[PDB]
């Protein structure tokens, strides 16, 4: 029902499907045409250093890509910037420009994912939007092999970055209360300035073997409201529990700021029940993302 649907309001973006063209290397992903330049994730040409450098061939490889016509893009001026291949458009405004988030990996809240797809029903290529949640470059929108290049926006339509990686599951540690979690897939973003929230970002795409989380995707305020509701219905003043940091990466400053007081022992002592039982009809993981929606 409406009681459990966050019903997030997202500003509608009018973008052509050509902002997110499928590039194929004979491998495939989407490019992201952002403000006069197309951005192509380098792993299109291979997912290990040796394979990529041979196939990309200092830019020669671009000549072997479908849907990357010299008529649209100035290939010769391609620049390999970190893990991204950036190529200027001949007509910088041929694709309408978009707003850019000034600090994408700092964003926490609802997001949209835009992806070009071929629709068999309507017999055409169309831009598709999906709703989800993001916490510092990690989101919860389902993706499949090839969806790299999908463009992530905040609710006001500011570009956060590009979908680039994931995993079927993650390992939980600071060990903490989430280590024993009995599958929690990851969805990972990279910014246009090669910012990505993973260890060893310079070569994350050739060298990452596992994704490590501290906790499920969460909003700090939403988590505090949820935990207060479960453990302290009268919201009596209780001291900061340091396990809020290790279990949820919530700081003392944040705890005092929002005024949601928590009896963490009660949470620990009923952890299994509280994380497997709904609040209203809302799941625990929904609540620590969006709040109690009352």
């Amino acid at each position: 029902s409406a009681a459990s649907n966050p019903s997030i309001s997202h500003i509608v973006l009018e973008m052509p499907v050509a902002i997110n063209p499928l590039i194929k290397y004979t491998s495939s992903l989407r490019g992201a045409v952002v403000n006069g330049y197309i951005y192509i994730q380098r792993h299109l040409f291979g997912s290990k250093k040796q394979e990529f450098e041979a196939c990309y061939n200092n830019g020669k490889g671009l000549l072997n890509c479908k849907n990357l016509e010299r008529s649209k893009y100035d290939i010769d001026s391609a620049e390999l910037i970190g893990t991204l291949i950036r190529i200027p458009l001949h007509d910088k405004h041929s694709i309408p420009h978009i707003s850019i988030h000034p600090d994408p990996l700092s964003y926490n809240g609802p997001v949209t994912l835009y992806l070009s797809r071929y629709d068999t029903e309507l017999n055409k290529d169309v831009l598709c939007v999906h709703t989800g949640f993001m916490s510092e470059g990690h989101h919860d929108i389902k993706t499949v092999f090839g969806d790299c290049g999908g463009m992530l926006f905040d609710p006001k339509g500011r570009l956060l970055g590009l979908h680039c990686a994931g995993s079927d599951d993650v390992v939980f540690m600071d060990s903490n209360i989430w280590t024993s979690y009995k599958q929690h897939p990851s969805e990972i973003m990279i910014t246009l300035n090669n910012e990505i929230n993973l260890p060893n970002p310079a070569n994350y795409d050739f060298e990452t073997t596992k994704v490590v989380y501290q906790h499920p995707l969460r909003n700090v305020c939403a988590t505090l409201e949820t935990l207060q509701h479960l453990t302290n219905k009268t919201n009596a003043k209780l001291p900061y529990d340091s396990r809020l940091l290790s279990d949820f990466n919530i700081t003392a400053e944040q705890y005092n700021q929002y005024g949601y007081y928590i009896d963490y022992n009660n949470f620990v002592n009923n952890f299994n029940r509280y994380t497997t039982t709904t609040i209203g009809t809302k799941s625990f993981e929904t609540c620590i993302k969006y709040g109690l929606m009352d």
């Binding site: 992903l29 994730q41 792993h43 997912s47 993706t143 499949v144 092999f145 090839g146 969806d147 790299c148 979908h163 680039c164 990686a165 994931g166 995993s167 795409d205 990452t208 073997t209 596992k210 994704v211």
Partner: peptide, 4 residues
């Protein structure tokens, strides 16, 4: 451990 995969790119997309």
């Amino acid at each position: 451990y995969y790119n997309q």
